[PDB]
Design an enzyme around this catalytic site. Structure first.
Site, short mmCIF file in Angstrom:
data_model
loop_
_atom_site.label_atom_id
_atom_site.label_comp_id
_atom_site.label_asym_id
_atom_site.label_seq_id
_atom_site.Cartn_x
_atom_site.Cartn_y
_atom_site.Cartn_z
N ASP A 189 13.18 12.90 66.41
CA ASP A 189 11.83 12.69 66.93
C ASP A 189 11.70 12.66 68.32
O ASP A 189 11.59 11.39 69.09
CB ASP A 189 11.51 11.12 66.22
CG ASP A 189 10.80 11.23 64.92
OD1 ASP A 189 10.66 12.31 64.29
OD2 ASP A 189 10.38 10.40 64.33
N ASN A 195 11.66 14.42 61.68
CA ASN A 195 10.62 14.77 60.96
C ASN A 195 9.47 15.57 61.73
O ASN A 195 8.95 16.47 61.48
CB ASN A 195 9.91 13.48 59.92
CG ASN A 195 9.49 12.53 60.86
OD1 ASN A 195 10.15 12.16 61.95
ND2 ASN A 195 8.17 12.07 60.50
N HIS A 196 9.65 15.00 62.60
CA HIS A 196 8.32 15.44 63.81
C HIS A 196 8.82 17.00 64.56
O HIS A 196 8.11 17.43 65.14
CB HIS A 196 8.22 14.30 65.10
CG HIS A 196 7.30 13.24 64.74
ND1 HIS A 196 6.00 13.42 64.76
CD2 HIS A 196 7.26 12.39 63.78
CE1 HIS A 196 5.48 12.34 64.53
NE2 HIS A 196 6.15 11.55 63.94
N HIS A 230 10.23 10.00 71.23
CA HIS A 230 8.78 10.29 70.96
C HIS A 230 8.21 10.59 72.27
O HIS A 230 6.97 10.31 72.59
CB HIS A 230 7.88 9.44 70.15
CG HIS A 230 7.89 9.38 68.70
ND1 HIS A 230 7.57 10.72 68.11
CD2 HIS A 230 8.66 8.48 67.72
CE1 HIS A 230 8.03 10.35 66.52
NE2 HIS A 230 8.43 9.05 66.42
N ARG A 260 4.61 7.02 52.78
CA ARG A 260 4.26 8.12 53.87
C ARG A 260 3.71 9.47 53.10
O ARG A 260 3.29 10.21 53.95
CB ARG A 260 5.64 8.48 54.70
CG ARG A 260 6.32 7.20 55.43
CD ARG A 260 7.72 7.67 56.01
NE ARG A 260 8.03 6.67 56.54
CZ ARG A 260 8.08 6.32 57.79
NH1 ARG A 260 7.13 6.82 58.83
NH2 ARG A 260 8.70 5.14 58.40
N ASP A 309 5.98 14.42 70.36
CA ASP A 309 4.78 13.78 69.88
C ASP A 309 4.62 12.29 70.43
O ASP A 309 5.46 11.55 70.70
CB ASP A 309 4.71 13.71 68.37
CG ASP A 309 4.89 15.14 67.78
OD1 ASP A 309 4.13 15.94 68.41
OD2 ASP A 309 5.42 15.13 66.52
N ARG A 310 3.42 11.99 70.59
CA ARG A 310 2.95 10.42 70.74
C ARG A 310 3.47 10.11 72.03
O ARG A 310 3.71 8.89 72.56
CB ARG A 310 3.63 9.25 69.68
CG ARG A 310 2.98 9.93 68.23
CD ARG A 310 3.30 8.52 67.55
NE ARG A 310 3.21 9.23 65.85
CZ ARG A 310 2.12 9.13 65.27
NH1 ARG A 310 1.07 9.01 65.89
NH2 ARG A 310 2.27 9.43 63.89
N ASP A 335 14.29 7.28 67.72
CA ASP A 335 13.21 7.77 68.21
C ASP A 335 12.98 7.60 69.51
O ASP A 335 12.96 6.39 70.15
CB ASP A 335 12.21 7.57 67.28
CG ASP A 335 12.13 7.77 65.86
OD1 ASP A 335 13.46 8.10 65.54
OD2 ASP A 335 11.43 7.55 65.09
N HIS A 372 13.79 6.73 62.48
CA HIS A 372 12.43 6.89 61.79
C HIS A 372 11.38 5.70 61.61
O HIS A 372 10.46 6.06 60.87
CB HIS A 372 12.66 7.80 60.47
CG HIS A 372 11.38 8.33 59.96
ND1 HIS A 372 10.49 8.96 60.64
CD2 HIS A 372 11.02 8.25 58.67
CE1 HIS A 372 9.55 9.54 59.91
NE2 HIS A 372 9.67 8.88 58.69
N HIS A 390 17.98 10.91 60.24
CA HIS A 390 16.80 10.63 60.66
C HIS A 390 16.21 9.71 59.55
O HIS A 390 16.07 8.40 59.68
CB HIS A 390 16.10 11.70 60.97
CG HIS A 390 14.76 11.15 61.59
ND1 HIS A 390 14.63 10.55 62.80
CD2 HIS A 390 13.43 11.25 61.02
CE1 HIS A 390 13.47 10.32 63.07
NE2 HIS A 390 12.61 10.63 62.12
FE LIG Z 1 10.67 9.92 62.42
ZN LIG Z 2 9.41 8.22 64.46
#
Ligand SMILES: [Fe+3]
Ligand SMILES: [Zn+2]
Lengths: 423, 581, 31, 308
Positions: free
Chosen positions: D84, D116-117, D58, D213, D87-88, D56, D240, D166
């Protein structure tokens, strides 16, 4: 002896509308209040001593709700503190802060607008440019007065914890912001960096024992500031000694009341320098203590805000009222100090005479220039109020005193009360 | 053809800041089209006080107003530009006021002496006596430009007005007065400097505000250069001594930061008597910031000392303090010394350097902090001409090895940048025996950045030691990596050839480096193969035409038939650039 | 529970992974 | 012709390297050509050695530049990112745009999987939608990228021995052929094999478990050993999950987690790692720290110039 306070105005009526701060400006003509919704409302006194009423002058959205995508948490838009800067020019400047960000807001008056166009009319109706031959410059014309508020600078991303205090230095350049564990020094014209002067964060948070509750700059000295801790001690720092103020110059703390709640009630919620700067006042849950800066071992004066609540701490702990952070403020001459209480009661302590009066901010006396009757609390003779009848939801946390006149702003949950001396 | 001008004029009212900003920058075009007479009566009143107050827009507006003298009708009507600038000198933003003050100073020169007393001097009085301290702050910067070209009566008023500013209640005004005190004294007559500047300089130096006192140090340098040397003791030194002993560390920092400037102003005689004791205290100051600032001035301060006692003072007074600083706990203080301590060797000489300075160099070379060790290594030239590098060689080598093998790759990067500098200083013979192994080890480092830096390091080394050394020492070793099982290391050979070919010349490239590149064209990894195509593209011009047609061309043509898309693309590009197909 | 000092200790325990994981479940639960 | 676009695409990469966003029109054109390339790729992408595997990022663009400085610049170094990308991070737009731009330019050199993101729901919750809205003033750019994410391959297989994905294993998946049979051109489902592949995590608890999660499942060592033997896999490269040391072996080295975002969310202070697979398929790990940010940190304990 006692000042005969009279009802002057009441303003306001939800959670978003609850007032969270009150602050007069240096001249005292402007009064600003913040609420949980992030709105700031400024009232300007009518200038037709001065006892003119206060009317809405400006209103703007200081802070908006935001989400912290790094920590995955919401950021409250509640306004914690409002601080006015000394008047640089015709415009007005104030610092507004939420838990994370400090914003510098400029409030200015505009009474003229441009007029005249070359390629169109004021209505926006265009014309063929081929027929435009002679140029004309627009001319300003008078218009109805309006007040505009805009954010000039944003100080963000500097505090890991929730900001609790902002204080402007006497040098007209810098101000400090104190979160739970760090105090940062800012330059009013620089937003991209800050100086972390105080950092009490332990290496292992499991050993954490103190948190900064308040901090303030000395009104006159540019190198002196104090900050209180949850343990009830005030550390006075001297910036001249060294760049980093980790080593305090003075420590103020006092040596039958060792109850289970002693630790909770001892936390200092507010600390205020006197206008003269020779004395310092701190408000804890039950008492107001005034410290001479030359006497570290004990305060010179101590006043009890509400002794009847000392026996009811158990009930207060259960309903979380024991954690309320009451404030305090001096008067212009430093002779009287004001602090709030429960049931819409606020307390006045006269230092010269050592006299106390309890006053109620209630709409029942909603008649201008009507004298406020002093209240009495009994644990019940005529006109006395029983302790068990007190409503702890009605809290007066935020109050302000006019810098020069006998005018006080008292903020209930949803209403702002202004009181004036009988004249 | 006036339509384009109409757009610009209307855009001034446009809400879009960018469009409004663009029109402001072209005010010269608008003013030029409108005419001289219309500009004074129409354009300037619109610009006199604009409701829009973006810092960028106002800043641009202030700049333009400083070049409008011709557009308004020349010097005869230059005073028409004051009202627009007076408003800008009152805004809250500091940079806008500073620019506005700069524009006012620029156009002041174009005012005639009569105009100054009629239009400009009254403007200064209005700003100086204004109710808003922003206006008073701007007024401080205007006294120096108008004072020289006014009558004696006007000069007396200006000095009185400047005196009031120095006593203003607002610290913001006093700071501006302190900043401008030095230049204002430069235009005053010597008699008034002693009588009027000094009392203001003394009062500001003892101000309650720390931010105001620290500005008095700068005024001390400016005033000292003006007064005769005999008068410095009576007038300047008493204030300068207090600054060095000021309780506020910030004030002492300025003294340390501008210590050399003070040294020139006061003169050698005062330096020995007062500055040298003051410098010792600064090096022993409780605040780490002050000590670090003093450390930077050790080399310069010692150099400027009079030859009559320079060596004796350094050995007896300054040198003992330096020893304590070497062992200072603060990392930054030690770093400051390392960059300048090496410069004391020429002053003290060979014998003193070996006895006193040399132990200090060894101590800092063994410091844990990489920054301190890097600083000492980067400034060895100051000591090379004094005692010779051979004595330091046996002590430099252990330090270099540790830096070259540091865990943090960025630390390894720093030493690589100084490698060509050290290699020349240490000589070819020493490099081959000791440092050659280190350079090769970098080429196979895990971090690509280190390998990239090492590749460029070879070029700089070859530029100094020449083609012959590279052929005997470097080329046979870099080509050995061609057989490395890791494709990242094999590509490093191609990268090395790319930079080496620029210097090694045609003969060496064709006979020793070119064959290796052609052999790698059959590498099983596609990444290597299209780097060969790129490598041939870069070194192709250096090769002879006969070589290109005989060897390079058939190899490139074969690559164009490669299955991988990238190999074909770069192979095609190589042919096009080389004009082979 | 309501003490600010206690909150920081809780905030510093759920810091690295727990808070993001908790919200991920909340987002997934919301669906 | 393709030549003119290739030079234009090269200019975008250089611009992106400088952390300068592409225009809305440029992004739309880039995404359209990206789909044409991605749509041809299977759910289990066949990756050839040598290659560098990354976790990741991100949207930590400056750390992505550090990754290249450590592992080398594309196309010289083959890369395999495991999702990923957004995000963030302050630079999710630049981070995803650069990787997508590289994929179009060097489809054979770089492989990007779906994390997943890379979902419409997740991106609107964790700031990627806001970043596009603030940097462009409209949701068109977010609409383009989210549509593109649907074509990203779910998993990759390196030399038929190392399986990269992932999230992790799924109860509904027993052989790689099951993965190839899935339909990935859709929004990340809340349940099923596709959801599990992007949300599952390894765990010490034996067998399958309930994912904290709220999505996917937790699988123990026994599950990993059975899956590897069934498909003849030597290792399961995984992403992940935050790891302080950058990489973390687990399940008797049957599963390895790789995290490539140093100082995750600018707060964690963790180390990032990337796994390099040699020409002979031998694996090596490189750990790196956050790139020194220019003019940062904002808050410092050294006296700033304005106070000096
Ligand atoms: Fe992830
Ligand atoms: Zn992640």
């Amino acid at each position: 002896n006692d000042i005969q306070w009279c009802f002057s105005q009441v303003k306001g009526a939800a959670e978003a509308d609850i007032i969270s701060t009150v602050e007069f400006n240096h001249s005292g003509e402007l009064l600003a209040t913040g609420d949980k919704g992030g709105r700031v409302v400024i009232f300007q006194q009518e200038q037709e001593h001065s006892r003119g009423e206060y009317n809405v002058y400006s209103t703007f959205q200081s802070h908006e709700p935001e989400f912290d995508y790094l920590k995955s948490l919401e950021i409250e838009e509640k306004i914690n503190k409002i601080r006015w800067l000394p008047q640089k020019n015709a415009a007005q400047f104030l610092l507004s802060t939420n838990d994370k960000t400090i914003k510098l807001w400029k409030i200015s008056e505009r009474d003229k607008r441009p007029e005249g166009y070359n390629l169109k009319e004021e209505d926006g109706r265009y014309r063929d440019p081929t027929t435009v031959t002679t140029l004309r410059v627009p001319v300003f014309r008078p218009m109805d007065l309006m007040v505009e508020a805009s954010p000039r600078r944003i100080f963000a991303n500097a505090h890991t914890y929730h900001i609790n205090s902002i204080s402007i230095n006497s040098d007209y350049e810098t101000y400090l912001s104190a979160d739970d564990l760090r105090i940062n020094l800012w330059h009013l014209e620089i937003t991209d960096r800050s100086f972390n002067i105080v950092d009490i964060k332990p290496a292992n948070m499991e050993e954490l024992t103190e948190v900064i509750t308040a901090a303030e700059f000395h009104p006159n000295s540019c190198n002196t500031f104090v900050y209180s801790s949850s343990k009830g001690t005030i550390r006075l720092c001297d910036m001249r000694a060294s760049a980093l103020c980790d080593r305090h110059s003075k420590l103020f703390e006092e040596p039958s009341n060792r109850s289970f709640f002693s630790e909770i009630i001892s936390s200092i919620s507010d600390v205020k320098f006197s206008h003269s700067g020779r004395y310092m006042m701190t408000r804890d849950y039950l008492s107001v203590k005034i410290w001479d800066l030359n006497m570290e071992n004990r305060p010179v004066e101590t006043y009890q805000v509400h002794e009847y609540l000392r026996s009811k701490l158990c009930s207060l702990y259960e309903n979380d009222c024991i954690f309320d952070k009451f404030e305090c403020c001096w008067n212009g001459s430093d002779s009287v100090v004001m602090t709030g209480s429960y049931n819409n009661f606020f307390r006045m302590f006269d230092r010269n005479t050592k006299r106390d009066i309890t006053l109620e901010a209630s709409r029942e006396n909603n008649k201008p220039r009507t004298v406020l009757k002093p209240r009495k609390v009994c644990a019940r003779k005529k006109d006395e109020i029983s302790v068990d009848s007190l409503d702890f939801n009605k809290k007066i946390l935020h109050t302000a005193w006019h810098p020069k006149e006998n005018i006080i702003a008292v903020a209930t949950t949803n209403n702002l009360y202004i009181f004036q001396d009988k004249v | 053809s006036l339509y384009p001008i109409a757009v610009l004029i209307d855009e001034l009212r446009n809400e879009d800041v960018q469009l409004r900003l663009n029109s402001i920058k072209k005010l010269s075009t608008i003013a030029l089209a409108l005419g001289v007479e219309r500009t004074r009566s129409e354009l300037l009143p619109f610009l006199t006080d604009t409701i829009y107050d973006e810092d960028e827009v106002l800043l641009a507006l202030a700049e333009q107003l400083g070049t409008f003298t011709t557009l308004v009708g020349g010097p005869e009507y230059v005073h028409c530009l004051l009202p627009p600038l007076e408003s800008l000198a009152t805004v809250e933003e500091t940079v806008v006021r500073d620019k506005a003050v700069e524009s006012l100073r620029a156009i002041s020169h174009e005012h005639s002496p009569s105009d100054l007393e009629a239009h400009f001097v009254p403007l200064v009085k209005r700003l100086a006596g204004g109710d808003w301290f922003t206006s008073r702050t701007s007024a401080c910067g205007l006294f120096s430009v108008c004072y020289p070209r006014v009558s004696s009566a006007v000069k007396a008023e200006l000095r009185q007005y400047f005196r009031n500013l120095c006593s203003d209640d607002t610290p913001m005004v006093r700071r501006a007065a302190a900043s401008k005190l030095g230049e204002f004294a430069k235009v005053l007559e010597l008699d008034n400097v002693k009588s009027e500047i000094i009392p203001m300089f003394s009062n500001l130096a003892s101000d309650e505000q720390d931010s105001v006192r620290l500005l008095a140090v700068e005024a001390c340098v400016n005033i000292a250069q003006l007064l005769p040397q005999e008068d410095l003791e009576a007038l300047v030194m008493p204030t300068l001594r207090q600054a060095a002993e000021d309780k506020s560390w910030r004030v002492r920092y300025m003294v340390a930061d501008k210590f050399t400037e003070l040294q020139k102003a006061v003169g050698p005689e005062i330096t020995k008597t007062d500055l040298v004791p003051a410098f010792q205290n600064l090096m022993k100051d409780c605040e780490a910031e002050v000590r670090a600032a003093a450390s930077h001035k050790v080399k310069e301060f010692c150099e400027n000392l009079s030859a009559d006692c320079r060596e004796n003072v350094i050995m007896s007074q300054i040198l003992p303090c330096i020893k304590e600083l070497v062992s200072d706990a603060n990392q930054h203080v030690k770093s400051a010394l390392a960059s300048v301590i090496m410069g004391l060797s020429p002053i003290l000489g060979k014998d003193n350097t070996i006895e006193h300075l040399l132990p200090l160099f060894l101590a800092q070379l063994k410091d844990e902090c990489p920054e301190v060790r890097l600083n000492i290594i980067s400034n060895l030239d100051c000591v090379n001409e004094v005692i010779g590098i051979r004595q330091l060689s046996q002590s430099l080598l252990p330090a270099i090895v540790e830096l070259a093998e540091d865990a943090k790759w960025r630390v390894r990067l720093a030493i690589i940048e100084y490698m060509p500098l050290l290699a020349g200083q240490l000589g070819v013979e020493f490099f081959d025996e000791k440092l050659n192994s280190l350079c090769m080890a970098w080429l196979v480092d895990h971090v690509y950045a280190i390998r990239e830096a090492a590749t460029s390091n070879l070029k700089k080394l070859v530029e100094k030691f020449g083609k012959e050394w590279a052929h005997a020492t470097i080329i046979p070793k870099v080509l050995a990596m061609s057989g490395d099982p890791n494709y990242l290391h094999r590509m490093t050979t191609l990268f090395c050839i790319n930079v080496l070919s620029e210097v090694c010349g045609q003969d060496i490239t064709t006979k020793h480096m070119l064959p290796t590149v052609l052999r790698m064209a059959g590498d099983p990894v596609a990444n290597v193969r299209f780097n060969v195509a790129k490598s041939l593209q870069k070194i192709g011009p250096i090769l002879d035409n006969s070589t290109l047609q005989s060897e390079v061309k058939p190899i490139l043509e074969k690559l164009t038939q490669d299955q991988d898309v990238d190999v074909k693309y770069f192979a095609q590009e190589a042919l096009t650039v080389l004009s082979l197909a | 529970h309501s003490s600010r000092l206690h909150q920081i200790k809780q905030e510093e325990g759920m810091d690295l992974i727990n808070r993001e994981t908790v919200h991920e479940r909340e987002v997934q639960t919301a669906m | 012709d393709e030549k003119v676009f290739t030079k234009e695409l090269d200019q975008w990469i250089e611009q992106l390297n400088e952390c300068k966003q592409l225009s809305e029109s440029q992004v739309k054109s880039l995404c359209e050509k990206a789909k044409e390339i991605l749509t041809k790729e299977s759910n289990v992408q066949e990756v050839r050695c040598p290659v560098t595997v990354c976790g990741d990022v991100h949207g930590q663009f400056h750390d992505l530049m550090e990754l290249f400085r450590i592992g080398g610049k594309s196309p010289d170094t083959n890369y395999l990112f495991m999702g990923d990308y957004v995000d963030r991070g302050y630079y999710s737009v630049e981070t995803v745009t650069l990787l997508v731009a590289l994929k179009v330019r060097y489809r054979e050199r770089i492989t990007i999987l779906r994390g997943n993101h890379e979902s419409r729901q997740i991106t609107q919750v964790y700031g990627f939608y806001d970043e596009c809205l603030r940097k462009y003033g409209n949701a068109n750019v977010w609409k383009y990228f989210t549509d593109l994410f649907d074509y990203l391959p779910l998993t990759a297989l390196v030399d038929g021995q190392i399986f990269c994905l992932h999230g992790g294993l799924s109860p509904s998946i027993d052989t790689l052929d099951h993965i190839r049979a899935l339909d990935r051109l859709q929004e990340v489902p809340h349940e099923g094999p596709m959801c599990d592949l992007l949300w599952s995590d390894p765990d010490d608890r034996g067998g399958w478990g309930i994912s904290p999660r709220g999505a996917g499942y937790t699988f123990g060592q026994d599950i990993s050993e059975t899956f590897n033997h069934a498909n003849g896999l030597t290792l399961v490269s995984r992403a992940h999950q935050l790891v302080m040391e950058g990489y973390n072996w687990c399940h008797d080295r049957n599963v390895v987690t790789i995290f490539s975002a140093p100082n995750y969310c600018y707060r964690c202070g963790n180390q990032a790692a990337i796994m390099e697979l040699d020409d002979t398929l031998k694996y090596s790990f490189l750990q790196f720290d956050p790139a020194p940010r220019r003019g940062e940190p904002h808050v410092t304990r050294r006296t700033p110039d304005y106070f000096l």
